[PDB]
Amino acid sequence: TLNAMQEAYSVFNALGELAGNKAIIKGCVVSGSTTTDGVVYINGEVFKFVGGQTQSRVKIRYVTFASGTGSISWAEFAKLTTLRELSRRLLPAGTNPQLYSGSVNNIPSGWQLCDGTNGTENLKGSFIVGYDPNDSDYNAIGKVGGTKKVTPSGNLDSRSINVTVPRDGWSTFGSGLGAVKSGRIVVGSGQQENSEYLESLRASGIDRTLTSTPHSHTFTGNQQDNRAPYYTLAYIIYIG
Amino acid sequence: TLNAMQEAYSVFNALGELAGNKAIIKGCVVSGSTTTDGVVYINGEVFKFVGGQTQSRVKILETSTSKEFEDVHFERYVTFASGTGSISWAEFAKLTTLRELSRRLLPAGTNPQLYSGSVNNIPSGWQLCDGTNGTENLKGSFIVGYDPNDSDYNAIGKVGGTKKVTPSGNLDSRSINVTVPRDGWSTFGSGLGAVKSGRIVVGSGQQENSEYLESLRASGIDRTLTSTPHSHTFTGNQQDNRAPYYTLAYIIYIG
Amino acid sequence: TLNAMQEAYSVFNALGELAGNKAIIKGCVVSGSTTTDGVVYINGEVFKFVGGQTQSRVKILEFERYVTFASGTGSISWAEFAKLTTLRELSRRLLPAGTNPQLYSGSVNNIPSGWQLCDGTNGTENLKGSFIVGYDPNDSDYNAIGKVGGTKKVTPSGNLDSRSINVTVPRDGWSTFGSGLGAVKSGRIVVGSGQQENSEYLESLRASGIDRTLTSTPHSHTFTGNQQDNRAPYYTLAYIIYIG
Ligand SMILES: [Mn+2]
């Protein structure tokens, strides 16, 4: 019965495959130039690892340091994170959206788009912003805002122009008076008045630099893209 | 003492629970119409798996250790089979190794995560990326990808941007033209007489039977003038610089 | 041999390190007021766990025999024992290599083994300098993975309407130059002196009656905007991805 009571326990070597080929199951920690004792798994077999002075290469009953044949690079052996630690690093289902660049038509089993269905956040078309308990814009999960496009707007101040109306250069029409069209400006002829002196008239004295009534203009802005350089990725989440 | 021995090693079957029920522990690799031999875990027992032609169901068989019956001790194993006690083979899962899971695990404190759960019930070992305990303070921020070749983004933690912005700009300078007419000034009062000092004198349209006034003429032309240039100052209204956003918490695993 | 064989199966205790110290391997579930039996791993040894009424502490009893609820010197807080997620469940929560970019705040010069920056090399997305936006099957801007757009800066643009300017030419305020006529420069506007004509009566003349409000041809101005920063408050993190 000892044959049946050896083959029965021998199947436990295969449990090393849960760690993976060339995994360090236990121990094998570096001190200085020495690696501590431990347990390794190689090609379907669980081995006690007898340490001592490090030799960057190992060989195989137990595993110890070597070089030559059948030398295995000790760099190929990996230390593991425990299932306890992996479980602690696992966030509750439905709370941890993930970035996804794979096929949107082949979302992995148990996963879905964060689209508002099945209790998910609807993250479609959104830029994420960090929750901030002290900012009213971001002090709760799911607070939204922002716009894809914006149109600039603004005002112009009111301004006047100046124009100088000259007292000179109006030219002349017709002859001495005589008559002048009613409401038509009268000018000098350049000639002295004959036999008479006109005290009621004078040459104009100055040009007139006039200021216009103020005016402004309406500004009509063109729509612009409010988005910083973006890259589309899907937000997916594990449901179960 | 062999009772204590069996009871001792039998506890190792419980290690299959690390994989979970109906796990493929080792082997059982598909090769066309074939599945290789391997090791499986079902209902608290670790079993050798005997492969062959892939079938939809498997079962625990108990057969004689003597594999020939020419002219009795049993062994238990799992194989492709059918009927009472058989299990759908599709319920058996191949696993990712702990070595591979460890390689996919980023160091503590280096991997911020999106979180939509309760901010008052952040899981054990995790905290908000708030600047405490050596974390990045990601509160109120939009993340931008590190770029070693862009001075805006060439270090972790480089910040910039503004929630609000005010557009600004300039206007060019323009002149206008205006035509001053020699006609249409109308009239006020009567013959001279007197006219207000510095007030434009115009024709009355009347002709007296008098000595001609040689010192005067009707004006000859209208006057087209160009103004001095002018511009305007633009005062922009503040605008929201943010694209459509959604608030999520950035959390990180510390330990 | 009841020794070199007992030594042979004892090595399997080290497989409990895959779960980790104080792991609940199997069972030990709250079933009302009681905790079920199971298997636990403590200090390099796999032990059978004997249950009962949920106690706060446990002990190794006869060390190398079993674990059960017991308090006092030698006891271990039961709360230090952790239930585990199976490898089957961890495998289901594992996304395919190359499909899952991750935020990274560690050293950019020491990116972990098997990981790389999402920089466009080795079939990766080039996420350098980008703000991520969620895929949306209903929005043509975001209806395929990797659609891009947006700009770091923007320059506002716009137009001004056309307006005409008015100016009023006054009939008064031209002042005077020189004396009575006499003579006035040819083509120079004649104004009143404010004095009565002495001997003559000038019926051919009158004071002007009105000021003249004139309108210009319409004008506009060209607006030239200043460049502005299009980014909302940002924080630089690296996007990395697991390749293999
Ligand atoms: Mn203007």
TrEMBL record, chain C:
- Binding positions (Mn(2+)): 219, 221
Q: Which domain of life is it from?
A: Bacteria
Give the CDD domains listed for this entry.
C24-like
The molecular function GO annotations come to: metal ion binding
| SUPFAM superfamilies referenced in this protein's UniProt entry, alphabetically | Receptor-binding domain of short tail fibre protein gp12
Q: What is this protein called?
A: Tail fiber protein
Keywords from the named record: Metal-binding
Organism ancestry: Bacteria, Pseudomonadati, Bacteroidota, Flavobacteriia, Flavobacteriales
